Nucleic acid binder design. Structure first.
Ligand code: DGT
Ligand code: CA
Ligand code: CA
Ligand code: CA
Length: 341
DNA sequence: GTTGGATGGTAGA
DNA sequence: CTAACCCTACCATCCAACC
């Protein structure tokens, strides 16, 4: 079993660089402009030049400009990056129809039947990087291993523009030596819970009673970690099927007023109902980010498919339900459809 | 017991 | 308006309806 994983380098900003090659070699910051004030919103991503100075995904545009005023600030153009991504995913598909598109910028290929061994896998890696460079001028990192988890880890170790194999031997070694916080799926909350226990390595999860582990981090994560430590992990590459599709938007200002909020919710419903594209949902959820950034939602599952009209009607109800039960003002409002027929 | 719906938490893009 | 956007996957918990 051999998995090749592809993850595009500083994606949104690299696309902008390809579109406008004069930007290459200099700082580039792609931004989500909330419209609340002069330069409100967050950085979606930045090129390596900008990251040198602490500008990265997630920080507020004004914070980025405080540390890099001279940089080039471009507004996120999601549709453009999705079109470049699709062209890339289809090139990848020529290397293996057995492909799992995991996100806007990354994909797992099962290549067990394209290559005999890791050295051939590595070579196909080199070919992939070249095709994507010839055809779309986008550099990418490649990670190759026996499974998804370690292929992802491998690419994390190779960024940017890299290529890493983690073979059966180094998987053994990493199980013993890799900080467990570097395992995909282990964020801040879990990592702090593991350290309290004294679990620092995947191998540690084997020297602890299951129920005390499951008691601290939940069953599923614990099962997953043990699986990895035993080297018995093997979740197959599967064709991506979207389980939910939604839209969320930021308001010019915070409100509790239904009439002040409706235009945003309706903007988001229209945009959502359009991304559905022949998919028919049975559940709708109205999602509200509050004053203090706490996320709050109200939903309904119907026994049947929701028409756009039903969606209009029910979301307004749901929104009112939020207002009725949470006494805080709202700052972002959206809607998410799920349970496709 | 099982299934699944409502709602929130965690993670990562 | 004074910093914090966008989108999706998965799981846990507290439930109720089932039989
Ligand atoms: N709006 C928004 N978009 C994000 C965020 N994080 C990532 N993205 C988008 C923009 C990125 O270019 C794209 C891929 O994200 P990645 O995590 O892979 O990092 P990126 O590709 O930018 O460079 P990376 O591989 O480190 O070199 O997804 C975020 O917090 N907000
Ligand atoms: Ca990525
Ligand atoms: Ca990337
Ligand atoms: Ca981590």
């Amino acid at each position: 079993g051999i998995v090749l994983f592809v993850d595009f380098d500083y994606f949104y900003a690299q696309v902008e660089e390809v579109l406008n090659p004069s930007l290459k070699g200099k700082p580039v910051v792609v931004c989500v402009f909330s419209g609340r004030f002069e330069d409100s919103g967050a950085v979606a991503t930045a090129n390596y030049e900008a990251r040198k100075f602490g500008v990265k995904a997630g920080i507020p545009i004004v914070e980025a400009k405080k540390i890099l005023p001279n940089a080039v600030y471009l507004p996120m153009r999601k549709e453009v990056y999705q079109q470049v991504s699709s062209r890339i995913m289809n090139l990848l598909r020529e290397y293996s129809e057995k492909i799992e598109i995991a996100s806007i910028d990354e994909a797992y290929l099962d290549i067990s039947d394209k290559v005999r061994d890791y050295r051939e896998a590595y070579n196909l890696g080199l070919e992939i990087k070249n095709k994507i460079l010839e055809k779309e001028k986008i550099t990418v990192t490649v990670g190759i291993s026996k499974n998804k988890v370690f292929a992802k880890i491998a690419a994390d170790m190779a960024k940017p523009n890299g290529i890493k194999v983690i073979d059966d031997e180094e998987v053994k070694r990493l199980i013993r030596e890799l900080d467990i916080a570097d395992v995909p799926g282990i964020g801040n909350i879990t990592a702090e819970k593991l350290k309290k226990l004294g679990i620092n390595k995947l191998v540690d999860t084997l020297s602890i009673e299951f129920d005390k582990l499951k008691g601290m981090i939940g069953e599923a994560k614990a099962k997953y970690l043990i699986s990895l430590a035993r080297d018995e992990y093997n979740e197959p590459i599967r064709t991506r099927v979207r389980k939910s599709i939604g839209r969320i938007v930021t308001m010019k200002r915070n409100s509790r007023n239904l009439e002040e909020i409706k235009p945003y919710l309706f903007r988001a419903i229209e945009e959502s109902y359009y991304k559905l594209d022949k998919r028919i949902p049975k559940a709708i959820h109205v999602v509200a980010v509050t004053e203090d950034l706490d996320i709050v939602s109200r939903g309904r599952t119907f026994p049947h498919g929701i028409s756009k009209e039903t969606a209009y009607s029910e979301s307004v109800k749901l929104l009112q339900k939020i207002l009725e039960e949470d006494e805080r003002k709202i700052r972002r409002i959206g809607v998410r459809f799920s349970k496709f027929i």
